[PDB]
Amino acid sequence: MASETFEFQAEITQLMSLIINTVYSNKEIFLRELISNASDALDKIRYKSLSDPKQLETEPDLFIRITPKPEQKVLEIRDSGIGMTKAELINNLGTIAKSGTKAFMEALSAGADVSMIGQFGVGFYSLFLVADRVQVISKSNDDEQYIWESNAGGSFTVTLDEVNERIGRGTILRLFLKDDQLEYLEEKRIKEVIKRHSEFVAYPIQLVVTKEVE
Amino acid sequence: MASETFEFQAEITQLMSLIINTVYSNKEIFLRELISNASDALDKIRYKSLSDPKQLETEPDLFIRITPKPEQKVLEIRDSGIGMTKAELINNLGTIAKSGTKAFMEALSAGADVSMIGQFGVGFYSLFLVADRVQVISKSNDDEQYIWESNAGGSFTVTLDEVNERIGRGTILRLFLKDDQLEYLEEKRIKEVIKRHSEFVAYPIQLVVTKEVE
Ligand SMILES: O=C/C1=C\CCOC(=O)c2c(O)cc(O)c(Cl)c2CC(=O)CCCC1
Ligand SMILES: O=C/C1=C\CCOC(=O)c2c(O)cc(O)c(Cl)c2CC(=O)CCCC1
Numbered sequence: 094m095a096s097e098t099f100e101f102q103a104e105i106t107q108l109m110s111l112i113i114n115t116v117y118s119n120k121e122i123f124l125r126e127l128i129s130n131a132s133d134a135l136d137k138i139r140y141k142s143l144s145d146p147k148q149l150e151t152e153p154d155l156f157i158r159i160t161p162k163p164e165q166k167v168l169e170i171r172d173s174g175i176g177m178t179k180a181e182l183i184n185n186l187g188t189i190a191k192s193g194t195k196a197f198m199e200a201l202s203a204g205a206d207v208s209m210i211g212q213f214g215v216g217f218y219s220l221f222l223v224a225d226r227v228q229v230i231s232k233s234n235d236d237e238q239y240i241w242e243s244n245a246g247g248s249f250t251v252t253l254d255e256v257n258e259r260i261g262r263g264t265i266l267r268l269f270l271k272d273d274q275l276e277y278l279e280e281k282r283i284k285e286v287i288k289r290h291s292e293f294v295a296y297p298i299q300l301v302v303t304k305e306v307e
Numbered sequence: 308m309a310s311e312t313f314e315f316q317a318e319i320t321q322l323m324s325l326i327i328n329t330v331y332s333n334k335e336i337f338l339r340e341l342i343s344n345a346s347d348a349l350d351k352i353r354y355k356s357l358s359d360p361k362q363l364e365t366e367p368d369l370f371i372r373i374t375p376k377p378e379q380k381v382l383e384i385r386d387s388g389i390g391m392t393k394a395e396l397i398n399n400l401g402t403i404a405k406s407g408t409k410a411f412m413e414a415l416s417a418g419a420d421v422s423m424i425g426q427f428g429v430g431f432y433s434l435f436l437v438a439d440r441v442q443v444i445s446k447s448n449d450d451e452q453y454i455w456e457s458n459a460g461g462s463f464t465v466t467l468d469e470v471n472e473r474i475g476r477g478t479i480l481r482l483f484l485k486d487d488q489l490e491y492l493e494e495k496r497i498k499e500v501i502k503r504h505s506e507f508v509a510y511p512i513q514l515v516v517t518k519e520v521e
Contacts, residue, residue: 154378158517164368255469287520298520303372306501306512 096250101187101243104194105218109245111198113221115207120223120274122208124283125290126216127170127266131157132294134174134264141175151234152261157294159287160301161278166270168224168277172296173263177229178236179251186217186229186241187249221245223277226269232260310464315401315457318408319432323459325412327435329421334437334488336422338497339504340430341384341480345371346508348388348478355389365448366475371508373501374515375492380484382438382491386510387477391443392450393465400431400443400455401463435459437491440483446474 101109135155142148152173160169177185184190197205197213210216220227229241238254257265276282280302287298315323349369356362366387374383391399398404411419411427424430434441443455452468471479490496494516501512 256473258472259470284520299517300520302516302518303513304516306498306514 094253094255096242096252098248098250099183099187101247101249102189102191102194103247104191104198105187106247108194108198108215108218109221109243111201112207112218113225113245115222117207117222119208121277121286122210122290123219123222124170124277124286126211126219128157128287128291128294128298129211130217131170131172131174131264132296134172134176135296136174138173138175138262148234151232152263156297156299158299158301159283161280161283161303163275163278166272166275166278168268168270169265170268171260171263171265173261176233176260176263177231177239178233179239180236181233182229182231182239182241182251187243220266220268223270223274224268225271228265228267228269230254230257230260230265230267232262232264234262308467308469310456310466312462312464313397313401315461315463316403316405316408317461318405318412319401320461322408322412322429322432323435323457325415326421326432327439327459329436331421331436333422335491335500336424336504337433337436338384338491338500340425340433342371342501342505342508342512343425344431345384345386345388345478346510348386348390349510350388352387352389352476362448365446366477370511370513372513372515373497375494375497375517377489377492380486380489380492382482382484383479384482385474385477385479387475390447390474390477391445391453392447393453394450395447396443396445396453396455396465401457434480434482437484437488438482439485442479442481442483444468444471444474444479444481446476446478448476 138148139155155173158171160171162169193214197210197215200209210219226244230238232238238259240252240254240257241249243249270277280300283300291298352362353369369387372385374385376383407428411424411429414423424433440458444452446452452473454466454468455463457463484491494514497514505512
């Protein structure tokens with residue numbers, strides 16, 4: 094299955110570079126930002142379903158789920174929200190939906206905390222604090238399942254998904270963690286971070302843990 | 308992606324019918340049989356790799372993993388063993404590899420315990436004690452990933468896999484549990500059954516648990 098390549102809007106490329114290189118101290122803020130986006134995407138399918146209830150049937154359970162995959166050094170953040178079509182992935186994540194972007198970079202230069210990133214509406218990119226690569230796997234009721242992929246470079250790919258588990262509906266952020274950021278694979282560390290900055294999340298936050306039976 | 312349909316050898320069809328309809332009491336024995344097959348498949352890749360070490364590289368971790376999926380009423384038993392090519396799935400699971408089969412049915416008629424099924428080499432089919440449908444997802448180093456599927460009828464399908472997560476190497480038995488057998492989705496029940504009939508398994512048996520953070 095053939096990938097398509099797209100160019101990032103230039104300011105997004107600049108932002109990713111700022112973020113993936115920054116020695117900023119509180120890298121854990123990425124999880125709050127991603128849970129927040131997850132929650133918003135869920136709000137959206139729930140709101141849409143007020144007038145179109147069958148939109149829920151592709152996945153009636155509304156949840157946020159976090160899945161460490163230690164062997165692959167991967168952390169997945171999944172939700173059963175509204176999801177994104179191919180065109181939404183291209184539009185929302187790369188070729189446009191910007192500044193926010195420029196204004197946040199200006200705030201940064203002036204001394205603003207990276208944690209403000211979500212107030213500028215670009216909190217997604219905070220994932221580069223702990224990951225050097227990301228796959229966004231998404232299924233909207235309106236399209237097939239697709240994979241958007243970026244390594245913080247100036248270009249991203251979008252590929253029809255024939256390799257991942259089917260999601261009924263929603264989105265998975267598959268983070269390929271940096272070698273020094275593997276603590277976010279750890280149950281206790283993950284739990285600690287979640288409890289700290291996400292008390293008023295209306296959806297279940299599920300942690301998937303692998304335990305050896307003895 | 309187009310499925311291919313195959314006919315079961317007739318005695319296998321008879322065995323599945325005996326098993327899926329039986330009111331036998333100790334249905335939990337299926338897990339021992341499947342963990343045993345998992346362990347054997349792992350022995351095989353480990354033995355093969357003695358003289359061909361790179362056979363391990365597609366998935367260097369040797370494990371058995373059990374994953375309840377409550378919403379789908381599914382239980383998955385995964386291993387990173389040798390796996391099966393398309394032709395092996397067809398051969399090993401349906402169109403041949405038999406009696407065992409007939410001899411076990413004869414032993415059953417005479418009064419033998421269903422738990423002897425593994426000593427006749429057909430323990431795989433014990434899964435129909437608790438499931439009315441099964442998908443066997445397999446990746447051998449020698450072939451693409453494939454899905455073999457059966458509902459205990461006289462025919463099964465084999466389909467090139469473009470819908471499930473990639474496994475590096477090995478096999479997943481995806482059991483669609485009967486409505487009265489949902490206890491095997493439960494962490495405590497699963498743990499209890501494992502500990503009982505599998506103390507001398509040389510590989511880690513991992514249980515995947517989903518816990519809501521609070
Ligand atoms: O407020 C929702 C919006 C769209 C709805 C769909 O979004 C999503 O699937 C989604 C998700 O489920 C988890 C995530 O980490 C992210 Cl980055 C996204 C996509 C965005 O948020 C991009 C901007 C649009 C805002
Ligand atoms: O002894 C191994 C054999 C083949 C090697 C590969 O088997 C496997 O992938 C495999 C597994 O990983 C888990 C399972 O529940 C089952 Cl049913 C199988 C397939 C069989 O056992 C069928 C008979 C052949 C014996």
